[PDB]
Amino acid sequence: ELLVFNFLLILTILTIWLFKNHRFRFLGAMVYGLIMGLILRYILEKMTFDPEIFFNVLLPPIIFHAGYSLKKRHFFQNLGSILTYAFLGTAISCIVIGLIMYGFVKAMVFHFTDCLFFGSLMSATDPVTVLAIFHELHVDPDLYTLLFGESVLNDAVAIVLTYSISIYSPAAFFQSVGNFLGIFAGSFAMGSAYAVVTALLTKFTKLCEFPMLETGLFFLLSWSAFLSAEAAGLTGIVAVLFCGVTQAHYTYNNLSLDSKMRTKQLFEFMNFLAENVIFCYMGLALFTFQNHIFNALFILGAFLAIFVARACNIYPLSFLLNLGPWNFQHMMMFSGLRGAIAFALAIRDTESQPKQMMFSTTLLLVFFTVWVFGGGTTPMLTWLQI
Amino acid sequence: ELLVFNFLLILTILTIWLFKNHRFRFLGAMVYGLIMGLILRYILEKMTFDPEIFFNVLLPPIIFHAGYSLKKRHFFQNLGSILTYAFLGTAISCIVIGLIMYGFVKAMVFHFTDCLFFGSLMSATDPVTVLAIFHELHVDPDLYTLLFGESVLNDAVAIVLTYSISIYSAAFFQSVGNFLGIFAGSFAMGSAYAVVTALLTKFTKLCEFPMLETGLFFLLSWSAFLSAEAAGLTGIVAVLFCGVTQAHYTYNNLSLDSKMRTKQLFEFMNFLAENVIFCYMGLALFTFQNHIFNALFILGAFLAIFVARACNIYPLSFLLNLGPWNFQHMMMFSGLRGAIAFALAIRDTESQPKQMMFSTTLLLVFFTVWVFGGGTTPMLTWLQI
């Protein structure tokens, strides 16, 4: 680990500059996959030692910022739509499996549980680049709130849902579903339990006179909720921390007026370290030789599956919502990226199943392919209508 | 390990809690480690797995903030004294070894090179307790701006000096060159990133992206530490300490927004120094193979503490006065011992069980100087403001 980190820093500086360099260019760190990966084909494995456990512990700060940055324009305005699209992840999973199951069976003219696992893994959808474009343009506030709320909810559903599948064992159907309800409900109550303590502590006691103390305890109490998830054995540790959204609505507004900017900037800095997650796609795209060894030509079934499965269950859900506005257009625009979280699930022990290794191969190619939607977002906006 | 890191926060929360109430009490977090240890003394080793190499990677942010928090009121009047205090750490190691040589030779009624490690280790001194009291009371600014100097200067000297003895065994001739070469090399490449950081944003307009430059500042500052260890140049904490030029040049150039953000970002990590302050007690109750020795050399080390702080500053005091100083601050220099000295005490901890007694003594030294550090207010009021 001496110079292993140093590889990240040099390209990160390039990533920092390209944001200021390519400010008006036609067009992130996604480009450097060909640059940094290829030059080191000829010490080699030490670049991507990267224990899969470590990735999970550095992701919670990324998603905690998402839950702590709500502009409070959806708690009562479009909350129902987000909760309606919370069930979309179940719809996404049940449709992706319906196609990829026929994909490998007809490819050979291996089991079925990985197909269920793959569908849950693919259910994540976090278009980070798309959300960044919307906010800076200072337009379509309703459209911005739609994608942001959906992207921060399905991933929380995806992580808990894929855990239930991984522990499913064939009656035996109910307890696997019961785990999904029990863990998610436990994550909401226990996760917010530490958040409630922070809110009342800073609202009754006049602790706002000590900016250093309030900021320190806020980070520790938020971190303790994430840490308490593993200690109690309740999974969905990201969801546990993500359920600290009440901190931004109640704890944030108590009495500080000074650490308000200090707290958001602190977690924004950790949120700004997402390029380490981004580079991990391409840095390990060639270093993980044992992972991408297969590169089987089954991606064509996956390619067609991801495009239609997301599209074929967003209009019907909106149609159900139309029963009780929506511009009849945003549903088509919803087709964004395929989530940063999905990569983390693809590296879960990396050896649980032969075709499971192929999942990581498919995910990497999709990421280098789905990003054209982010690049091709502006023509999509101007194609028919805004 | 998942639950081990959890209970390290509740006692850190209590650290925040104690300072909320202790704004008027007679007087902090140093004792919470013992309280948790006693409860856990009655699964056990997993609390203090704590690889010793990982201790030296969470420590540099403490050093960087110390070098980044200079008040710029010491280099103009007390710089010569502070630079002369770099020899204090060297002469301390020269006298401590002789005092500790008689500690065991006369007691018997290891090897000499092992005693050198302990002597150089004592040169480190980080009186965080005294400095905290000074700033909050707004007292003796002249003494504060120079006491901070030696406090961090010898820490950079201590780490390189205790590493230089690795070649000691006619091998003593190149030791001085190796010590000076590494220290000089640390200043060159360590401050080079600060120069690179300064010129990068002095010409370009990074003010439109205050968030981008903050990451770049952290990325560039971290690179200096990482590049030193990767290239084999030791004194990595000293290399990051050479980031004081970041405050001299980069801090004041054009930011006007991230200046407070950068200070608060690093001081928050420096505000998490209690983790260093908490690591001792867990190892002081569970690692019976390491700390249980506690041989009857504590008093010998205890006597060596005061004389080392007295037999060295006093001879140098006359030289500095030759070119006022009121002749009073010299007696006050009998201060704390710090926390970086522990990081040297945990250098692989596996020389010999009979030789590892020095680590046991150092833990007691912090406890004995904690109450001594606590009883600082009577000393301050007695002499002068």
- Please give the resolution of this entry in Å, rounded to 1 decimal: 3.5
Residues 237-296 of B with CB under 8 A from A: 261, 264-265, 267-268, 271-272
Report the 3 state secondary structure along chain A: CCCHHHHHHHHHHHHHHHHHHCCCCCCCHHHHHHHHHHHCCCCCHHHHCCCHHHHHHHCHHHHHHHHCCCCCCCCCCCHHHHHHHHCHHHHHHHHHHHHHHHHHHHHCCCCCHHHHHHHHHHCCCCCHHHHHHHHHHCCCHHHHHHHHHHHHHHHHHHHHHHHHHHCCCCCCHHHHHHHHHHHHHHHHHHHHHHHHHHHHHHHHCCHHHCHHHHHHHHHHHHHHHHHHHHHCCCCCHHHHHHHHHHHHHHHCCCCCCCHHHHHHHHHHHHHCCHHHHHHHHHHHHHHCCCCCCCCCCCHHHHHHHHHHHHHCCCHHHHHHHHHCCCCCCHHHHCCCCCCCHHHHHHCCCCCCCHHHHHHHHHHHHHHHHHHHHHHCHHHHHHHCCC
- Sequence-separated (6 or more) residues with CB below 8 Å from residue A277: A55, A58, A59, A62, A340, A343
Q: How far apart are alpha carbons A175 and A169 in whole angstroms?
A: 10
B58 touches chain A (CB under 8 A): no
Q: How far apart are alpha carbons A307 and A288 in whole angstroms?
A: 27
CATH number for the segment(s) B1-383: 1.20.1530.20
Q: Cα B143–B145–B148 angle (5° rounding)?
A: 100
Residues in chain A closer than 8 A to B9 (CB atoms): 220, 223-224, 227
Q: How far apart are alpha carbons B92 and B272 in whole angstroms?
A: 30
Q: Where are the domains of chain B?
A: 1-383
- CA dist list (Å): A191 to A194, A221, A247, A250, B330: 6, 10, 11, 15, 54
Q: Judge contact between B249 and B196, C-beta under 8 A.
A: no
Chain B interface, best mutation among A209, A219, A260, A265, by max B CB count within 10 A:
A265
The encoded tokens of residue A206 equal 């006049």
Cβ distance of A228 and B16 shorter than 8 Å: no
Q: How far apart are alpha carbons A360 and A186 in whole angstroms?
A: 30
Q: Give the DSSP letter of residue B250.
A: I
A to B CB pairs, distance under 8 Å: 86
CB-nearest partner of A13 from B204, B219, B272 = B219
Q: How far apart are alpha carbons B193 and B198 in whole angstroms?
A: 8
Q: How far apart are alpha carbons B87 and A199 in whole angstroms?
A: 52
Q: How far apart are alpha carbons B354 and B357 in whole angstroms?
A: 6
| DSSP reduced 3-state for B371 | helix
Method: cryo-EM
Task: Tell me which amino acid residue B9 is.
Answer: L
Residue of chain A minimizing CA distance to B54: A1
Cβ distance of A9 and B214 shorter than 8 Å: no
Q: Judge contact between A320 and A78, C-beta under 8 A.
A: no
- CA dist list (Å): B306 to A126, B274, B310, B377: 62, 26, 6, 19
Distance from CA of B155 to the nearest CA of A (A): 23
B19 touches chain A (CB under 8 A): yes
- Sequence-separated (6 or more) residues with CB below 8 Å from residue A126: A151, A152, A155, A337, A339, A340, A341
Task: Tell me which amino acid residue B101 is.
Answer: M
Nearest Cα residue to B224 out of B206, B205, B237, B208: B237
Q: Judge contact between B269 and B2, C-beta under 8 A.
A: no
From the number of C-beta atoms within 10 Å of its C-beta (0-12, 13-18, 19+), residue A321 rates as middle
The encoded tokens of residue A84 equal 């309606």
CATH number for the segment(s) A3-382: 1.20.1530.20
Cβ distance of A2 and B222 shorter than 8 Å: no
Q: Judge contact between A102 and A91, C-beta under 8 A.
A: no
CB-nearest partner of B9 from A3, A19, A220 = A220
The encoded tokens of residue B7 equal 């209970």
Nearest Cα residue to A279 out of A29, A14, A17: A29
CB-nearest partner of A216 from B214, B261, B271 = B271
Residues in chain A closer than 8 A to B20 (CB atoms): 205, 207, 210, 213
- Sequence-separated (6 or more) residues with CB below 8 Å from residue B328: B383, B384
Distance from CA of A1 to the nearest CA of B (A): 9
Nearest Cα residue to B274 out of B64, B3, B15, B57: B15
Q: How far apart are alpha carbons A254 and A209 in whole angstroms?
A: 13
Residues in chain A closer than 8 A to B215 (CB atoms): 12, 16, 269, 272-273
- Sequence-separated (6 or more) residues with CB below 8 Å from residue A152: A63, A66, A67, A126, A242
Q: Give the DSSP letter of residue B248.
A: I
CB-nearest partner of A215 from B3, B9, B268 = B268
- CA dist list (Å): A5 to A190, B111, B270: 35, 38, 22
Count the Cβ atoms, other than its own, within 10 Å of residue A339. 25
Residues in chain A closer than 8 A to B6 (CB atoms): 224, 227-228, 230-231
CB-nearest partner of A207 from B20, B204, B218 = B20
Nearest Cα residue to B132 out of B276, B267, B275: B267
| Buried-state track A92-131, b at ≥16 Cβ within 10 A, e below 16 | bbebbbebbbebbeeeeeeeeebbbbbbbbbbbbbbbbbb
